[PDB]
Design a protein around this ligand. Structure first.
Ligand SMILES: CCc1c(-c2csc(CCNC)n2)[nH]c(C)c1C(C)=O
Ligand SMILES: [Mg+2]
Length: 104
């Protein structure tokens, strides 16, 4: 489990400092985005994964992968592919699948 959680730390750090990460650093504010609360049932963002990972609330790397994927699934549910946020989500998702697969 040590190697699981430590690569989780690596990939999370790299997502946090990635150029295209700007939409996903903090929770979406439903007051600012019309219709978000109604459409996205389980919001997720990199700072929430950071909190949980630091507290140790991820038992395996698979749950960490679940939260990251949830970030990008929400992104694609709410945002147009050609929107700025959608484009950044695609760069970040491709990034994450890529970094995940070259380890596991
Ligand atoms: C379009 C709003 C949005 C942002 C957004 C736009 S601007 C910004 C600054 C955050 N501070 C680093 N976040 N992100 C996500 C995941 C959004 C949606 C609706 O899915
Ligand atoms: Mg999926």
């Amino acid at each position: 489990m040590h190697s699981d959680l430590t690569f989780c730390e690596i990939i999370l750090m790299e997502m946090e400092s990635h150029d295209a990460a700007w939409p996903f650093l903090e929770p979406v504010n439903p007051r600012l985005v019309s219709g978000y609360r109604r459409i996205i049932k389980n919001p997720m963002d990199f700072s929430t994964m950071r909190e949980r990972l630091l507290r140790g609330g991820y038992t395996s790397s698979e749950e960490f992968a679940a939260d990251a994927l949830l970030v990008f699934d929400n992104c694609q549910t709410f945002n147009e592919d050609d929107s700025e946020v959608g484009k950044a989500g695609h760069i970040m998702r491709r990034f994450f699948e890529s970094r995940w697969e070259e380890f596991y």
